[PDB]
Design an enzyme around this catalytic site. Sequence first.
Site, PDB file in Angstrom:
ATOM      1  N   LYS A  43      30.322  41.316  46.615  1.00 24.45           N
ATOM      2  CA  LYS A  43      29.456  42.067  45.719  1.00 24.45           C
ATOM      3  C   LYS A  43      28.306  41.164  45.301  1.00 24.45           C
ATOM      4  O   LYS A  43      28.351  39.946  45.493  1.00 24.45           O
ATOM      5  CB  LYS A  43      30.222  42.583  44.495  1.00 24.45           C
ATOM      6  CG  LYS A  43      31.003  41.517  43.754  1.00 24.45           C
ATOM      7  CD  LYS A  43      31.740  42.091  42.556  1.00 24.45           C
ATOM      8  CE  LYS A  43      32.596  41.033  41.888  1.00 24.45           C
ATOM      9  NZ  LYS A  43      33.282  41.558  40.681  1.00 24.45           N
ATOM     10  N   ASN A  94      28.822  37.933  43.389  1.00 25.05           N
ATOM     11  CA  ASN A  94      29.418  36.797  44.074  1.00 25.05           C
ATOM     12  C   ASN A  94      28.472  36.176  45.093  1.00 25.05           C
ATOM     13  O   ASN A  94      28.920  35.471  46.002  1.00 25.05           O
ATOM     14  CB  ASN A  94      30.728  37.211  44.744  1.00 25.05           C
ATOM     15  CG  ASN A  94      31.832  37.500  43.743  1.00 25.05           C
ATOM     16  OD1 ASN A  94      31.755  37.100  42.579  1.00 25.05           O
ATOM     17  ND2 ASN A  94      32.872  38.190  44.194  1.00 25.05           N
ATOM     18  N   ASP A 128      36.076  40.749  48.055  1.00 18.23           N
ATOM     19  CA  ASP A 128      35.336  40.734  46.795  1.00 18.23           C
ATOM     20  C   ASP A 128      33.838  40.552  47.020  1.00 18.23           C
ATOM     21  O   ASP A 128      33.149  39.922  46.215  1.00 18.23           O
ATOM     22  CB  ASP A 128      35.872  39.648  45.866  1.00 18.23           C
ATOM     23  CG  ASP A 128      36.876  40.180  44.856  1.00 18.23           C
ATOM     24  OD1 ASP A 128      37.175  41.392  44.890  1.00 18.23           O
ATOM     25  OD2 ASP A 128      37.361  39.384  44.024  1.00 18.23           O
TER      26      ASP A 128
HETATM   27  C1  L1Z Z   1      42.928  43.401  39.111  1.00 19.62           C
HETATM   28  C2  L1Z Z   1      42.504  42.817  40.465  1.00 19.62           C
HETATM   29  C3  L1Z Z   1      42.174  41.329  40.262  1.00 19.62           C
HETATM   30  O1  L1Z Z   1      41.569  41.004  39.241  1.00 19.62           O
HETATM   31  N1  L1Z Z   1      42.559  40.388  41.172  1.00 19.62           N
HETATM   32  C4  L1Z Z   1      43.189  40.571  42.353  1.00 19.62           C
HETATM   33  C5  L1Z Z   1      44.354  41.307  42.575  1.00 19.62           C
HETATM   34  C6  L1Z Z   1      44.875  41.348  43.870  1.00 19.62           C
HETATM   35  C7  L1Z Z   1      44.298  40.677  44.873  1.00 19.62           C
HETATM   36  N2  L1Z Z   1      44.609  40.563  46.167  1.00 19.62           N
HETATM   37  C8  L1Z Z   1      43.694  39.768  46.722  1.00 19.62           C
HETATM   38  O2  L1Z Z   1      43.669  39.442  47.911  1.00 19.62           O
HETATM   39  N3  L1Z Z   1      42.819  39.384  45.796  1.00 19.62           N
HETATM   40  C9  L1Z Z   1      41.620  38.507  45.883  1.00 19.62           C
HETATM   41  C10 L1Z Z   1      41.939  37.180  46.560  1.00 19.62           C
HETATM   42  C11 L1Z Z   1      40.685  36.325  46.598  1.00 19.62           C
HETATM   43  N4  L1Z Z   1      39.603  37.019  47.316  1.00 19.62           N
HETATM   44  C12 L1Z Z   1      38.405  36.170  47.336  1.00 19.62           C
HETATM   45  C13 L1Z Z   1      38.499  35.146  48.282  1.00 19.62           C
HETATM   46  C14 L1Z Z   1      39.033  35.367  49.551  1.00 19.62           C
HETATM   47  C15 L1Z Z   1      39.108  34.324  50.476  1.00 19.62           C
HETATM   48  C16 L1Z Z   1      38.634  33.056  50.147  1.00 19.62           C
HETATM   49  C17 L1Z Z   1      38.722  32.014  51.081  1.00 19.62           C
HETATM   50  N5  L1Z Z   1      39.959  31.851  51.724  1.00 19.62           N
HETATM   51  C18 L1Z Z   1      40.125  30.830  52.664  1.00 19.62           C
HETATM   52  O3  L1Z Z   1      41.207  30.680  53.228  1.00 19.62           O
HETATM   53  C19 L1Z Z   1      39.051  29.998  52.948  1.00 19.62           C
HETATM   54  C20 L1Z Z   1      39.202  28.978  53.884  1.00 19.62           C
HETATM   55  N6  L1Z Z   1      37.876  30.170  52.325  1.00 19.62           N
HETATM   56  C21 L1Z Z   1      37.667  31.135  51.414  1.00 19.62           C
HETATM   57  C22 L1Z Z   1      36.378  31.174  50.867  1.00 19.62           C
HETATM   58  C23 L1Z Z   1      35.842  30.014  50.318  1.00 19.62           C
HETATM   59  C24 L1Z Z   1      34.564  30.006  49.772  1.00 19.62           C
HETATM   60  C25 L1Z Z   1      33.798  31.163  49.784  1.00 19.62           C
HETATM   61  C26 L1Z Z   1      34.321  32.326  50.345  1.00 19.62           C
HETATM   62  C27 L1Z Z   1      35.602  32.330  50.893  1.00 19.62           C
HETATM   63  C28 L1Z Z   1      38.118  32.845  48.871  1.00 19.62           C
HETATM   64  C29 L1Z Z   1      38.039  33.880  47.950  1.00 19.62           C
HETATM   65  C30 L1Z Z   1      39.276  38.277  46.623  1.00 19.62           C
HETATM   66  C31 L1Z Z   1      40.478  39.199  46.607  1.00 19.62           C
HETATM   67  C32 L1Z Z   1      43.197  39.953  44.654  1.00 19.62           C
HETATM   68  C33 L1Z Z   1      42.659  39.885  43.440  1.00 19.62           C
END
Ligand code: L1Z
Length: 411
Positions: free
Chosen positions: A245, A248, A243
């Site tokens: 962009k 963010n 994500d």
């Molecule tokens: C319609 C689509 C929708 O609206 N949503 C959607 C649907 C399917 C999805 N599949 C999928 O993966 N995502 C989202 C899952 C979340 N990430 C964002 C994300 C990814 C990893 C993390 C993340 N992780 C960790 O472990 C650790 C230690 N620190 C972080 C972290 C902490 C702070 C700042 C940055 C990273 C924190 C946020 C974005 C993609 C989905 C979102």
Amino acid sequence: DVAIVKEGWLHKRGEYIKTWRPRYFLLKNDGTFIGYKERPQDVDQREAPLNNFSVAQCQLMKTERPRPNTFIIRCLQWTTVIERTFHVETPEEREEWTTAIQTVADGLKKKHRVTMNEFEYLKLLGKGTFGKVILVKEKATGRYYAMKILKKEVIVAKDEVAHTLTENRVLQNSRHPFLTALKYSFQTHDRLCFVMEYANGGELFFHLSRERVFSEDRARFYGAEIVSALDYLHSEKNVVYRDLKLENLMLDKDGHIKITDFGLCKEGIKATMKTFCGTPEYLAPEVLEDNDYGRAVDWWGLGVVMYEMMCGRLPFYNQDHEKLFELILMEEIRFPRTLGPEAKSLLSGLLKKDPKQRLGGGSEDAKEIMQHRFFAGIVWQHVYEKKLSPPFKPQVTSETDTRYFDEEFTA
Ligand SMILES: CCC(=O)Nc1ccc2[nH]c(=O)n(C3CCN(Cc4ccc(-c5[nH]c(=O)c(C)nc5-c5ccccc5)cc4)CC3)c2c1
């Protein structure tokens, strides 16, 4: 001893473009559940597994809506609840898949308390299917936070496990200097709450819009910090951010980049009867096409961010989503003549359509980008340790300074 426990053809609903597509999925004993457009020639790649596809600690749901013989895999990844919905043609196939998925997940099993009363509600940042995110202020310190309030039934079944969930997640290597840190975690009777540090140096789209363009020097600084953060997530955490962009990205009081984690999964908006979820302008092509993806998706996102900082414009843009997808999938990126060759070499490398040919898409991941000539002269240990002075100092004197929350934000 990583082996395939089950494989076959499924129907998977698109994550951002909500349509069903046939995919060949591989279930492995290490927890990875990844699908491909067609059967791959290599069974297991050497690079480390990514948690985005892991099945560990999942919840399996069998539904007849919206389509019969649907099953849903639901996981809490960090602080976001993600769902993947699948469909098979017979109920007998769904049981075989769900049983196999469940056995892999089970095989992988292997004040003094903070309350809602300590915070003052300020503003709603977003609503999702499984909860909401709100801007709050801790009354004792005056510092601002984003609180993710998630429904507890969705995540964990037992109150004893959720207490260990709040207890663990606060300490589980939350800190990299350019990631928004998760500070508190508590729970109510029906809600799970994640409290994250909120940067008060202004959103990066705010700063970019008023200054219209960043110089190559100022974009190199933010870009180097993003590379450092993405390197941590890929190597240390084995997670792809996906994500990345401009919306963010924020600055703290000192002017350093903070990558936010304020998102929540929503059901998209209904292309009269097509349900799209969010905006597609930043999505990597392999993400748009529901193909298998890896660490290269973040480097595409880096490219989009770097392109808009140095050119003052999104790389691909069209009001029609149908035309936009073709722009992102087919049309090649074009650059203004103001960009130097090092900026063009980096941006064209980051925005290659083929992830296996994309800069940073090889086995060396972020090191390909750190050694690129655009980042020549950058000492990467000094980036992590914040020894580089920020080229822009936000107009705040403290972290309780609310200037980028006031109505000067309109300007
Ligand atoms: C319609 C689509 C929708 O609206 N949503 C959607 C649907 C399917 C999805 N599949 C999928 O993966 N995502 C989202 C899952 C979340 N990430 C964002 C994300 C990814 C990893 C993390 C993340 N992780 C960790 O472990 C650790 C230690 N620190 C972080 C972290 C902490 C702070 C700042 C940055 C990273 C924190 C946020 C974005 C993609 C989905 C979102």
